Amino acid sequence: SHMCDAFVGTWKLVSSENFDDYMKEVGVGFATRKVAGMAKPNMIISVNGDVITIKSESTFKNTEISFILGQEFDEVTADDRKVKSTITLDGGVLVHVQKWDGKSTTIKRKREDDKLVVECVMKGVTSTRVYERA
């Protein structure tokens, strides 16, 4: 057993707060905000050795990242940013920093009761996205 055991599984979005304002702060344009904001993604998290994979599937886009903790990688986000990402574990929280165009956003993923809670921060703006097991 290991590092991210409690994250592994298939998860479905059950609530979102302040996501439009997060996306605005990130620089996402109107039509992508509207369509992406409707989506109810499924997130599939798996671990194989040191490699963590996070897959997201939705009506809008499917995304997938695979990574080693602490090791920077290139990521294409769902809104089509080309970013440089580093993901670490800090006190049981997955902390994901994305850098692009001199900007930065941080996404935290944590287990809270039977939920997986995702907090997305861009400058002073936070969005909270709650997932439950599928």
Ligand X SMILES: O=C(O)[C@H]1CCCC[C@H]1COc1cccc(C(F)(F)F)c1
Q: Which residues are annotated as a binding site for a fatty acid?
A: 129-131
- Give the shortest CB-74-to-ligand X separation in angstroms: 16
| Cα distance between residue 89 and residue 56, in whole Å | 20
The site for ligand X (CB under 6 A) is made up of 36, 39, 41, 43, 56-58, 60-63, 78, 107, 118, 120, 129
In the numeric block, which tokens belong to residue 88?
A: 């670490």
Of 52 and 118, nearer to ligand X (C-beta) is 118
Of 69 and 121, nearer to ligand X (C-beta) is 121
- Give the shortest CB-112-to-ligand X separation in angstroms: 15
- Give the shortest CB-62-to-ligand X separation in angstroms: 6
| Cα distance between residue 134 and residue 122, in whole Å | 28
The torsion angles phi and psi of 78, rounded to 5 degrees, stand at -65, -35
| Cα distance between residue 114 and residue 63, in whole Å | 24
Of 18 and 49, nearer to ligand X (C-beta) is 18
| Number of neighbouring beta carbons within 10 Å of residue 7 | 20
Of 87 and 118, nearer to ligand X (C-beta) is 118
Classify burial at 86, counting beta carbons within 10 Å of its beta carbon; exposed 0-12, middle 13-18, buried 19 or more.
Answer: middle
- Give the shortest CB-64-to-ligand X separation in angstroms: 9
CB nearest ligand X: which residue?
Answer: 56
